[PDB]
Design a protein around this motif. Structure first.
Motif, PDB file in Angstrom:
ATOM      1  N   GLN B  57      19.137  36.489 102.451  1.00 38.86           N
ATOM      2  CA  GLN B  57      19.925  35.719 103.386  1.00 38.86           C
ATOM      3  C   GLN B  57      19.891  36.436 104.732  1.00 38.86           C
ATOM      4  N   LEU B  58      20.442  37.648 104.743  1.00 40.48           N
ATOM      5  CA  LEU B  58      20.488  38.491 105.928  1.00 40.48           C
ATOM      6  C   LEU B  58      19.075  38.637 106.520  1.00 40.48           C
ATOM      7  N   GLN B  59      18.119  39.061 105.705  1.00 39.89           N
ATOM      8  CA  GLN B  59      16.750  39.219 106.187  1.00 39.89           C
ATOM      9  C   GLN B  59      16.261  38.040 106.991  1.00 39.89           C
ATOM     10  N   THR B  60      16.424  36.859 106.437  1.00 41.15           N
ATOM     11  CA  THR B  60      15.938  35.695 107.124  1.00 41.15           C
ATOM     12  C   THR B  60      16.610  35.517 108.486  1.00 41.15           C
ATOM     13  N   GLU B  61      17.917  35.767 108.545  1.00 37.09           N
ATOM     14  CA  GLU B  61      18.652  35.629 109.795  1.00 37.09           C
ATOM     15  C   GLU B  61      18.157  36.639 110.804  1.00 37.09           C
ATOM     16  N   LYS B  62      18.012  37.879 110.360  1.00 37.36           N
ATOM     17  CA  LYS B  62      17.533  38.928 111.242  1.00 37.36           C
ATOM     18  C   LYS B  62      16.219  38.502 111.847  1.00 37.36           C
ATOM     19  N   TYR B  63      15.376  37.864 111.058  1.00 37.85           N
ATOM     20  CA  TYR B  63      14.099  37.445 111.596  1.00 37.85           C
ATOM     21  C   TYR B  63      14.264  36.416 112.713  1.00 37.85           C
ATOM     22  N   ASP B  64      15.203  35.496 112.522  1.00 34.84           N
ATOM     23  CA  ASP B  64      15.469  34.444 113.493  1.00 34.84           C
ATOM     24  C   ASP B  64      16.097  34.998 114.762  1.00 34.84           C
ATOM     25  N   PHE B  65      17.116  35.823 114.603  1.00 35.71           N
ATOM     26  CA  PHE B  65      17.735  36.428 115.765  1.00 35.71           C
ATOM     27  C   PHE B  65      16.641  37.116 116.546  1.00 35.71           C
ATOM     28  N   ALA B  66      15.683  37.665 115.821  1.00 35.94           N
ATOM     29  CA  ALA B  66      14.608  38.366 116.459  1.00 35.94           C
ATOM     30  C   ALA B  66      13.756  37.434 117.276  1.00 35.94           C
ATOM     31  N   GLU B  67      13.150  36.466 116.613  1.00 33.03           N
ATOM     32  CA  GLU B  67      12.287  35.554 117.328  1.00 33.03           C
ATOM     33  C   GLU B  67      13.037  34.958 118.474  1.00 33.03           C
ATOM     34  N   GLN B  68      14.334  34.793 118.305  1.00 30.75           N
ATOM     35  CA  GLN B  68      15.121  34.221 119.361  1.00 30.75           C
ATOM     36  C   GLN B  68      15.053  35.098 120.614  1.00 30.75           C
ATOM     37  N   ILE B  69      15.420  36.365 120.491  1.00 29.88           N
ATOM     38  CA  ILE B  69      15.403  37.190 121.675  1.00 29.88           C
ATOM     39  C   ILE B  69      14.051  37.042 122.355  1.00 29.88           C
ATOM     40  N   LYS B  70      12.957  37.104 121.604  1.00 25.22           N
ATOM     41  CA  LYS B  70      11.651  36.989 122.244  1.00 25.22           C
ATOM     42  C   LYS B  70      11.589  35.748 123.109  1.00 25.22           C
ATOM     43  N   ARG B  71      11.978  34.615 122.542  1.00 20.34           N
ATOM     44  CA  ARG B  71      11.926  33.387 123.297  1.00 20.34           C
ATOM     45  C   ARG B  71      12.787  33.523 124.533  1.00 20.34           C
ATOM     46  N   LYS B  72      13.981  34.080 124.370  1.00 21.03           N
ATOM     47  CA  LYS B  72      14.887  34.244 125.490  1.00 21.03           C
ATOM     48  C   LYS B  72      14.271  35.183 126.529  1.00 21.03           C
ATOM     49  N   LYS B  73      13.706  36.282 126.060  1.00 27.87           N
ATOM     50  CA  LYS B  73      13.060  37.217 126.952  1.00 27.87           C
ATOM     51  C   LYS B  73      12.055  36.490 127.843  1.00 27.87           C
ATOM     52  N   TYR B  74      11.414  35.455 127.318  1.00 26.70           N
ATOM     53  CA  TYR B  74      10.449  34.714 128.116  1.00 26.70           C
ATOM     54  C   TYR B  74      11.175  33.782 129.089  1.00 26.70           C
ATOM     55  N   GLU B  75      12.328  33.260 128.670  1.00 26.10           N
ATOM     56  CA  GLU B  75      13.120  32.361 129.517  1.00 26.10           C
ATOM     57  C   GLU B  75      13.450  33.153 130.763  1.00 26.10           C
ATOM     58  N   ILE B  76      13.764  34.422 130.541  1.00 29.76           N
ATOM     59  CA  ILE B  76      14.107  35.326 131.612  1.00 29.76           C
ATOM     60  C   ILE B  76      12.937  35.500 132.551  1.00 29.76           C
ATOM     61  N   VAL B  77      11.829  36.010 132.041  1.00 31.19           N
ATOM     62  CA  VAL B  77      10.675  36.196 132.893  1.00 31.19           C
ATOM     63  C   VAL B  77      10.504  35.026 133.846  1.00 31.19           C
ATOM     64  N   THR B  78      10.558  33.814 133.309  1.00 34.75           N
ATOM     65  CA  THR B  78      10.422  32.623 134.133  1.00 34.75           C
ATOM     66  C   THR B  78      11.616  32.466 135.055  1.00 34.75           C
ATOM     67  N   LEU B  79      12.812  32.562 134.507  1.00 34.30           N
ATOM     68  CA  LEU B  79      13.975  32.435 135.346  1.00 34.30           C
ATOM     69  C   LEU B  79      13.958  33.466 136.471  1.00 34.30           C
ATOM     70  N   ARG B  80      13.208  34.559 136.327  1.00 34.89           N
ATOM     71  CA  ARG B  80      13.171  35.548 137.404  1.00 34.89           C
ATOM     72  C   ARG B  80      12.199  35.086 138.460  1.00 34.89           C
ATOM     73  N   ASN B  81      11.075  34.530 138.032  1.00 27.04           N
ATOM     74  CA  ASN B  81      10.098  34.040 138.988  1.00 27.04           C
ATOM     75  C   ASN B  81      10.675  32.909 139.819  1.00 27.04           C
ATOM     76  N   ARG B  82      11.602  32.142 139.249  1.00 26.00           N
ATOM     77  CA  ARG B  82      12.172  31.034 139.990  1.00 26.00           C
ATOM     78  C   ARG B  82      13.110  31.577 141.022  1.00 26.00           C
ATOM     79  N   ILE B  83      13.661  32.745 140.727  1.00 28.88           N
ATOM     80  CA  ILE B  83      14.594  33.397 141.625  1.00 28.88           C
ATOM     81  C   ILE B  83      13.874  33.951 142.832  1.00 28.88           C
ATOM     82  N   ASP B  84      12.731  34.583 142.611  1.00 23.69           N
ATOM     83  CA  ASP B  84      11.991  35.113 143.734  1.00 23.69           C
ATOM     84  C   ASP B  84      11.415  33.979 144.554  1.00 23.69           C
ATOM     85  N   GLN B  85      10.744  33.055 143.881  1.00 23.57           N
ATOM     86  CA  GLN B  85      10.134  31.899 144.540  1.00 23.57           C
ATOM     87  C   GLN B  85      11.177  31.197 145.395  1.00 23.57           C
TER      88      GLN B  85
END
Ligand code: CA
Ligand code: CA
Ligand code: CA
Ligand code: CA
Lengths: 56, 90, 372, 159, 71, 56
Positions: B57-85
């Motif tokens: 149960q826990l394992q599976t969640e940990k995996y999701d929370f994980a993939e999530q941050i990655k996706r979010k980390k990318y949201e950021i990269v983009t959200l930063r470029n929009r800030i500079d632009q």
């Protein structure tokens, strides 16, 4: 003995703080004094470009 | 700027120590002892797996929370470029 | 974003309005708190008949209008004319429609319960804002300097205040109000400068005495041997060039004007002055909280911007406070907008969302809801 | 009422038909409008648990007659705003995703290279001129790349 | 007076749509593939459990798991 | 007691000296910073009197 020790520690902490923000007052002093010889310099220049264009 | 050094210690140590116990409090709750020891023999069977599922149960969640941050980390990269632009001090 | 972008912060003053969006670092809009009413019938070329004028168009056209100040000494005295300044702020200055923006407003220190309920009645019932909130001014100033306990000496255009705050709650019984501020101060300079042998005759002479006060005025520490210095006549003097050539010189009076804030006797005021008042506020508070207030004298307001105000105050209260005490006079650079910035921070904050008074709260609880 | 106009103008008989059936179930007594309580019941059936405050806010969002209740008209308005917001969210999500697919190098941009690839990756026949042309038309800030904002704009419309 | 210019724009659109259309079909590919990675990861970090013998094993394993859980 | 008293007096004299020249660093700082807002101000003035006479 105890009183002389405690007001001694408070004399030393006030000394240490007073040395620390002194260092800080002197660094800001230096910085502002330097920005200035620069602004005052830039000025003899804009005022002299001036009597010139005003006379012309 | 060295009078702010005492601020570092107080601040960091503070927040970090606050975070710790919280994590301890939280994690502690979600923990129910392995009380069941020598009460039955086939019990272990119906028990062991339950633990197994909880783990999975826990394992599976940990995996999701994980993939999530990655996706979010990318949201950021983009959200930063929009800030500079979207800077143009013009 | 819905309201992260969308929160407005309007700080209503006796002289100026400061306004803008929560999030920004400084007010998007700053303008006089006047409402001009034309003394005669007629028009400007290309415009229609205007019933009213607000802010700078009222100041610029003052010769044909009767000017009125809605906020006397920080308190809203005329509600018809205030709704006019708000209207101008939303629709012309910030050009937003108010019915989709949460609005954080500010009020004064001992603002009557009934007023906080009335501006809520006007915010929700005539402007139809989604949600609003009224913060006390000294409290936003403190908070904008990071802290939660301290005492704010707040001084703007019509009022001065001392508001001792402890873990966020401004202490009603220890607050002091001194009705002498930057407005009083420009008019006193005026006289010591005509008295220097001058004439501020046309309205273009009047207005600029205020720009002299702002640019060249000082608060000297040891105002005693500064007059003495004036006399030996050092290169302490300072000449300002008027709208035209007419170079006016101001040597000395330069600091005689902010010495009015420590000596109200310079202007026929019998009240005590800024530093004594800081102190009296403090010996009116609980005993255990007095070391806190002393190490956290936060200054805010246009009139506390006179250079060397902090050093004079530093030494003014050290020498009245018990020597066992730590004195500390915080005066930040952005202080003419502390109040506003404290509101910008607070209202853009992640945790403030749950204190916004919504039309749901209002339509259901009456103005009482936000009044607290 | 002006809203209830375009709102009903927006929807189709089909829509109205169903939104009605739906409205009827909201309305217990069958009087003609959802009350602060009639709403609460349906919300829970829908899996929520609103509070008095929350409910009203949700009510007075389309209550033009200050009734404190919602009629099949104020309702259609509400459905419409939602219909709108839904479709908007779904759109931006899809595009958002598309940008990540086209980006892949994760620099938060889409350079003429990737644009070519992805384009050439389509079945369609294209020559470099096409690619660079689409770049020049899309890149408004003339910096070479295509930022998410620009990508939103450029794809504005396209399906 | 650029009478033909109209066809140029339509192209970008035709292409833009060729792009999006491409996107979507690629979007679900990555999606499912992604999942595949998820079941493999889980495939080894917690493989189809196989309950041991009877005595020490069941107990042991149980203790093993229970500790990993806190982990 | 005696030792704590003597190194205490020496802590206080160093504190007093360190406060005194700090006051002096801050007064010189304040003076230069003020001379500056004056020179930099005088300059926006000479540079703006300038774009004006050059345009005229
Ligand atoms: Ca009903
Ligand atoms: Ca209704
Ligand atoms: Ca890229
Ligand atoms: Ca670009």
């Amino acid at each position: 003995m105890q009183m002389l020790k405690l007001d001694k520690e408070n004399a030393l902490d006030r000394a240490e703080q007073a040395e620390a923000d002194k260092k800080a007052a002197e660094d800001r002093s230096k910085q502002l004094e330097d920005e200035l010889v620069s602004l005052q310099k830039k000025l003899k220049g804009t005022e002299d470009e001036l009597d010139k264009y005003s006379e012309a | 700027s060295y009078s702010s050094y005492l601020a570092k210690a107080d601040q960091k140590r503070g927040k970090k120590q606050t975070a710790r116990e919280t994590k301890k409090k939280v994690l502690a709750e979600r923990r129910k002892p392995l009380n069941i020891d020598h009460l039955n023999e086939d019990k272990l069977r119906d028990k062991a797996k339950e633990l197994w599922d909880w783990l999975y149960q826990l394992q599976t969640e940990k995996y999701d929370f994980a993939e999530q941050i990655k996706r979010k980390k990318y949201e950021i990269v983009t959200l930063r470029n929009r800030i500079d632009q979207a800077q143009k001090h013009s | 974003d819905e309201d992260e972008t969308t929160a407005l912060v309007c700080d209503n003053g006796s002289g100026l309005v400061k306004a803008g969006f929560a999030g920004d670092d400084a007010p998007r809009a700053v303008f006089p708190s006047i409402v001009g009413r034309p003394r005669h019938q007629g028009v400007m070329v290309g415009m229609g008949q205007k019933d009213s004028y607000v802010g700078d168009e009222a100041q610029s056209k003052r010769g044909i209008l009767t000017l009125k100040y809605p906020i006397e000494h920080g308190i809203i005295t005329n509600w018809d004319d205030m709704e006019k300044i708000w209207h101008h702020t939303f629709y012309n200055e910030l050009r937003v429609a108010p019915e989709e923006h949460p609005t954080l407003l500010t009020e004064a220190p001992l603002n009557p319960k009934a007023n906080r309920e009335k501006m809520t009645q006007i915010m929700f019932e005539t402007f139809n804002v989604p949600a609003m909130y009224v913060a006390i001014q000294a409290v936003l100033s403190l908070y904008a300097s990071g802290r939660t306990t301290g005492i704010v000496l707040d001084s703007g255009d019509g009022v001065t205040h001392n508001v001792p705050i402890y873990e966020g709650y401004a202490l009603p019984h220890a607050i002091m109000r001194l009705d002498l501020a930057g407005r009083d101060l420009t008019d006193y300079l005026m006289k010591i400068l005509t008295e220097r042998g001058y004439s501020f005759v046309t309205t273009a002479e009047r207005e600029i005495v205020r720009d002299i006060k702002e640019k060249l005025c000082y608060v000297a520490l040891d105002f005693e041997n500064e007059m003495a210095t004036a006399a030996s006549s050092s290169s302490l003097e300072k000449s300002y060039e008027l709208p035209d050539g007419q170079v006016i010189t101001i040597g000395n009076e330069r600091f005689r004007c902010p010495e009015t804030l420590f000596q109200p006797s310079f202007i026929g005021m019998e009240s005590a002055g800024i530093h004594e008042t800081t102190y009296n506020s403090i010996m009116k508070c609980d005993i255990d909280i007095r070391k806190d207030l002393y190490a956290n004298n936060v200054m805010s307001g246009g009139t506390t911007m006179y250079p060397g105000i902090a050093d004079r105050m530093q030494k003014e209260i050290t020498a009245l406070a018990p020597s066992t005490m730590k004195i500390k006079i915080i005066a930040p650079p952005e202080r003419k907008y502390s109040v506003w910035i404290g509101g910008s921070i607070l209202a853009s904050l992640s945790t403030f969302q749950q204190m916004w008074i919504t039309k749901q709260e209002y339509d259901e609880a009456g103005p009482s809801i936000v009044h607290r | 009422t002006d809203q209830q106009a375009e709102a009903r103008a927006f929807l189709s008989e089909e829509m109205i038909a169903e939104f009605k059936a739906a409205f009827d179930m909201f309305d217990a007594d069958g009087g003609g409008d959802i009350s602060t309580k009639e709403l609460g019941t349906v919300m829970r059936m829908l899996g929520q648990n609103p509070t008095k405050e929350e409910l009203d806010a949700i009510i007075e969002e389309v209550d033009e007659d200050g009734s404190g209740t919602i009629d099949f008209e104020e309702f259609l308005v509400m459905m419409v705003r939602q219909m709108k917001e839904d479709a908007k969210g779904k759109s931006e999500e899809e595009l958002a995703n598309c940008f990540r697919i086209f980006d892949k190098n994760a620099d938060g941009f889409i350079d003429i290279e990737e644009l070519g690839e992805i384009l050439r990756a389509t079945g369609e026949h294209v020559t470099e001129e096409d690619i660079e042309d689409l770049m020049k038309d899309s890149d408004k800030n003339n910096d070479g790349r295509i930022d998410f904002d620009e990508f939103l704009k450029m794809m504005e419309g396209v399906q | 007076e650029e009478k033909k210019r109209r066809a140029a724009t339509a192209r970008r659109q035709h292409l833009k749509s060729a792009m999006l259309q491409l996107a979507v079909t690629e979007i679900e590919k990555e999606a499912a593939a992604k999942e595949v990675e998820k079941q493999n990861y889980l495939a080894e970090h917690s493989p189809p459990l196989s309950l041991p013998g009877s005595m020490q094993e069941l107990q042991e394993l149980s203790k093993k798991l229970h500790a990993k859980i806190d982990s």
